[PDB]
Design a protein around this ligand. Structure first.
Ligand SMILES: NCC1=CC[C@@H](N)[C@@H](O)O1
Length: 297
């Protein structure tokens, strides 16, 4: 997990774009993979915090570029690109800023039942279109082999929980990894392009028109189960309700909501194991302990 100063950032941009003038610069946000800088008022630059971050940055650029004018809501446009380095596919990248504020659940539930439904309608239209873009030209690296992932995780988990679990706990885990892997509902799906981190903080809203005016943060975008773009909004309190996601599902004409519900349940259980893995990948001891705790109950 590496760090940047403001001058390091200015320097990094100047050296590739010497004729770009930075008048103002502020940190607008930061996640696991990237720190984000608001440049002038018009641009968001992401700098990666590690190798994997950089790859996901690279992946965001290529995906934004290839869907640039293809969707019914605005989305970031790539304008500046950085360079490969030793272990980083992409030293930085610079995107247009999209006007709007996050469509928090709070902001959502304070909208009249009308503007609520329009937002649900508009989200279903964005998703339908995202999940319909033709996937044929996309390289294997831009897809998620989900069974390969669960197996990858399974191995990692054994390496890490060797010596943290009793054999009978470690077996309650084996049984979970096999209950999943012997269930085709998780893998028998029409893969398509997805946002894959589709959540209220990445949905921008125009309070003047009380309409959605943007979608951001395509770093995790990949070719995968279209259901994942609904499951990421279902969480109560943190995200929208279950009731609201049904509204979206129906404008979207999803023909099997109970399967979506089942995926959601699994996902929630599964998060303890991801916390463990990511806790170590990223160096979040707290995530690691939380994961360990939930597992022990
Ligand atoms: N359910 C917890 C949860 C899962 C997805 C994660 N990105 C987390 O932020 O919320």
């Amino acid at each position: 997990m590496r760090t940047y100063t403001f001058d390091q950032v200015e320097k990094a941009i100047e050296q590739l774009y010497p004729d770009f003038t930075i008048n103002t610069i502020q940190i607008s946000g930061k996640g696991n993979d990237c720190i984000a800088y608001e440049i002038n008022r018009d641009f968001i630059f992401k700098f990666p915090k590690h190798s994997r971050g950089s790859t996901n940055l690279f992946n965001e650029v290529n995906i934004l570029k290839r869907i640039h004018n293809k969707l019914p809501l605005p989305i970031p446009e790539v304008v500046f690109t950085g360079m490969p380095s030793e272990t980083y596919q992409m030293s930085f990248a610079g995107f247009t800023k999209i006007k709007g504020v996050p469509l928090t659940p709070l902001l959502l539930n304070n909208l009249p039942k009308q503007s609520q439904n329009q937002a649900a309608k508009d989200l279903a239209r964005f998703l339908s279109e995202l999940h319909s873009i033709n996937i044929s030209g996309f390289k294997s690296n831009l897809v998620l082999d989900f069974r390969e992932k669960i197996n990858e995780d399974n191995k990692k988990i054994k390496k890490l929980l060797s010596r943290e679990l009793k054999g009978p706990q470690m077996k309650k885990v084996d049984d979970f990894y096999r209950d999943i892997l012997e269930n085709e509902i998780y893998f028998k799906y029409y893969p398509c392009l997805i946002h894959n981190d589709f959540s209220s903080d990445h949905i921008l809203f125009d309070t003047e028109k009380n309409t959605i005016c943007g979608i951001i943060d395509f770093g995790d975008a990949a070719i995968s189960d279209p259901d994942n773009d609904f499951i990421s909004l279902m969480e109560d309190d943190e995200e929208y309700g279950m009731e609201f996601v049904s509204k979206i599902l129906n404008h979207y004409k999803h023909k099997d909501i109970p399967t979506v519900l089942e995926k959601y349940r699994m996902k929630e259980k599964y998060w303890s194991f991801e916390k463990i893995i990511y806790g170590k990948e990223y160096g979040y001891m707290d995530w690691y302990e939380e994961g360990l705790n939930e597992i022990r109950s």
